[PDB]
Motif scaffolding. Structure first.
Motif, PDB file in Angstrom:
ATOM      1  N   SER A  14      -4.590   1.853   9.171  1.00 52.89           N
ATOM      2  CA  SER A  14      -4.898   0.299   9.054  1.00 52.89           C
ATOM      3  C   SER A  14      -5.211   0.052   7.567  1.00 52.89           C
ATOM      4  N   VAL A  15      -5.622   1.059   6.576  1.00 54.47           N
ATOM      5  CA  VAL A  15      -6.117   0.688   5.372  1.00 54.47           C
ATOM      6  C   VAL A  15      -5.284   1.591   4.336  1.00 54.47           C
ATOM      7  N   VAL A  16      -4.709   2.483   5.030  1.00 51.45           N
ATOM      8  CA  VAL A  16      -3.934   3.695   4.194  1.00 51.45           C
ATOM      9  C   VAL A  16      -2.477   3.549   4.310  1.00 51.45           C
ATOM     10  N   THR A  17      -2.101   3.195   5.552  1.00 50.75           N
ATOM     11  CA  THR A  17      -0.355   3.045   5.973  1.00 50.75           C
ATOM     12  C   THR A  17       0.285   2.087   4.939  1.00 50.75           C
ATOM     13  N   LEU A  18      -0.852   0.831   4.744  1.00 55.08           N
ATOM     14  CA  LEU A  18      -0.267  -0.336   4.034  1.00 55.08           C
ATOM     15  C   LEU A  18      -0.002  -0.100   2.639  1.00 55.08           C
ATOM     16  N   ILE A  19      -0.967   0.414   2.048  1.00 54.28           N
ATOM     17  CA  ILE A  19      -0.947   0.765   0.482  1.00 54.28           C
ATOM     18  C   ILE A  19       0.166   1.857   0.378  1.00 54.28           C
ATOM     19  N   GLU A  20       0.324   2.858   1.288  1.00 52.49           N
ATOM     20  CA  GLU A  20       1.179   3.870   1.487  1.00 52.49           C
ATOM     21  C   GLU A  20       2.467   3.409   1.440  1.00 52.49           C
ATOM     22  N   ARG A  21       2.921   2.323   2.257  1.00 54.99           N
ATOM     23  CA  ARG A  21       4.396   1.746   2.358  1.00 54.99           C
ATOM     24  C   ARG A  21       4.486   0.723   1.168  1.00 54.99           C
ATOM     25  N   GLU A  22       3.556   0.402   0.411  1.00 52.85           N
ATOM     26  CA  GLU A  22       3.693  -0.575  -0.772  1.00 52.85           C
ATOM     27  C   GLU A  22       3.486   0.414  -2.088  1.00 52.85           C
ATOM     28  N   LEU A  23       2.449   1.171  -2.157  1.00 53.37           N
ATOM     29  CA  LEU A  23       2.149   1.783  -3.541  1.00 53.37           C
ATOM     30  C   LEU A  23       3.187   2.873  -3.650  1.00 53.37           C
ATOM     31  N   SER A  24       4.586   2.705  -4.448  1.00 48.01           N
ATOM     32  CA  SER A  24       5.515   3.454  -4.863  1.00 48.01           C
ATOM     33  C   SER A  24       6.262   2.559  -5.695  1.00 48.01           C
ATOM     34  N   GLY A  25       7.184   3.468  -6.430  1.00 46.05           N
ATOM     35  CA  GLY A  25       7.788   2.797  -7.418  1.00 46.05           C
ATOM     36  C   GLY A  25       7.374   2.429  -8.930  1.00 46.05           C
ATOM     37  N   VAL A  26       6.074   2.617  -8.759  1.00 45.53           N
ATOM     38  CA  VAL A  26       5.527   2.466  -9.941  1.00 45.53           C
ATOM     39  C   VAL A  26       5.870   3.362 -11.073  1.00 45.53           C
ATOM     40  N   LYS A  27       5.616   2.628 -12.096  1.00 40.65           N
ATOM     41  CA  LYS A  27       6.339   3.246 -13.442  1.00 40.65           C
ATOM     42  C   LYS A  27       5.599   4.808 -13.411  1.00 40.65           C
ATOM     43  N   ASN A  28       6.733   5.590 -13.486  1.00 40.84           N
ATOM     44  CA  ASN A  28       6.741   7.390 -13.465  1.00 40.84           C
ATOM     45  C   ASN A  28       5.321   7.671 -12.656  1.00 40.84           C
ATOM     46  N   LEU A  29       5.443   7.499 -11.339  1.00 36.73           N
ATOM     47  CA  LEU A  29       4.871   7.663 -10.571  1.00 36.73           C
ATOM     48  C   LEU A  29       5.205   9.365  -9.987  1.00 36.73           C
ATOM     49  N   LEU A  30       4.484  10.300 -10.022  1.00 40.00           N
ATOM     50  CA  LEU A  30       4.670  11.694  -9.702  1.00 40.00           C
ATOM     51  C   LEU A  30       4.530  11.860  -8.533  1.00 40.00           C
ATOM     52  N   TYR A  31       3.337  11.932  -7.833  1.00 39.14           N
ATOM     53  CA  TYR A  31       2.953  12.263  -6.541  1.00 39.14           C
ATOM     54  C   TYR A  31       1.607  11.607  -6.185  1.00 39.14           C
ATOM     55  N   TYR A  32       1.464  10.886  -4.818  1.00 39.49           N
ATOM     56  CA  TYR A  32       0.231  10.235  -4.644  1.00 39.49           C
ATOM     57  C   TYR A  32      -0.224  10.831  -3.460  1.00 39.49           C
ATOM     58  N   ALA A  42     -11.542   5.878   2.404  1.00 37.28           N
ATOM     59  CA  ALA A  42     -10.354   6.390   2.150  1.00 37.28           C
ATOM     60  C   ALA A  42      -9.932   6.301   0.435  1.00 37.28           C
ATOM     61  N   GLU A  43      -9.659   7.435   0.052  1.00 40.76           N
ATOM     62  CA  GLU A  43      -9.249   7.400  -1.453  1.00 40.76           C
ATOM     63  C   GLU A  43      -8.133   7.890  -1.592  1.00 40.76           C
ATOM     64  N   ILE A  44      -7.312   7.255  -2.432  1.00 41.70           N
ATOM     65  CA  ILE A  44      -5.853   7.607  -2.851  1.00 41.70           C
ATOM     66  C   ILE A  44      -5.565   8.021  -4.322  1.00 41.70           C
ATOM     67  N   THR A  45      -5.186   9.057  -4.472  1.00 43.25           N
ATOM     68  CA  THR A  45      -5.172   9.717  -5.757  1.00 43.25           C
ATOM     69  C   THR A  45      -3.592   9.626  -5.970  1.00 43.25           C
ATOM     70  N   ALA A  46      -3.253   8.826  -7.167  1.00 43.02           N
ATOM     71  CA  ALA A  46      -1.793   8.753  -7.555  1.00 43.02           C
ATOM     72  C   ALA A  46      -1.743   9.483  -8.897  1.00 43.02           C
ATOM     73  N   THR A  47      -1.090  10.568  -8.954  1.00 42.70           N
ATOM     74  CA  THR A  47      -0.762  11.118 -10.226  1.00 42.70           C
ATOM     75  C   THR A  47       0.584  10.749 -10.801  1.00 42.70           C
ATOM     76  N   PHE A  48       0.479  10.196 -12.139  1.00 39.47           N
ATOM     77  CA  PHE A  48       1.729   9.690 -12.757  1.00 39.47           C
ATOM     78  C   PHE A  48       2.502  10.974 -13.282  1.00 39.47           C
TER      79      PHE A  48
END
Lengths: 48, 48
Positions: A14-32, A42-48
């Motif tokens: 409910s609070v991670v699937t959304l961000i997951e489905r949206e957080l993407s395609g940002v500048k040079n995102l390597l892996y999140y 719930a904490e989400i580390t996005a490494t660029f």
């Protein structure tokens, strides 16, 4: 993000699937990665 | 476009907010909240 008092499985679905489905395609995102613990955090580390 | 005859409304004794509701809701296709469909939270849309 914090869902005060919810089963980890509810926070993820409910609070991670959304961000997951949206957080993407940002500048040079390597892996999140994401982790939801017992206490309702719930904490989400996005490494660029 | 419509012309809600306010005079009639008052003469008829009908609340204006109810006419507004009926129109807006009659055409809108509003979305309410999610529901777990085969492991994924999918929307629950209502519509005329």
């Amino acid at each position: 993000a914090t869902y005060p008092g919810a089963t980890a499985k509810t926070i993820n679905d409910s609070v991670v699937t959304l961000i997951e489905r949206e957080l993407s395609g940002v500048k040079n995102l390597l892996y999140y990665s994401a982790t939801t613990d017992t206490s309702g955090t719930a904490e989400i580390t996005a490494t660029f | 476009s419509l012309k809600i005859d306010r005079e009639k409304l008052s003469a008829l004794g009908v609340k204006f907010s109810d006419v507004s509701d009926i129109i807006s809701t009659s055409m809108g296709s509003m979305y309410i909240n999610d529901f777990p469909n085969q492991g994924r939270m999918q929307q629950v849309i209502v519509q005329v």
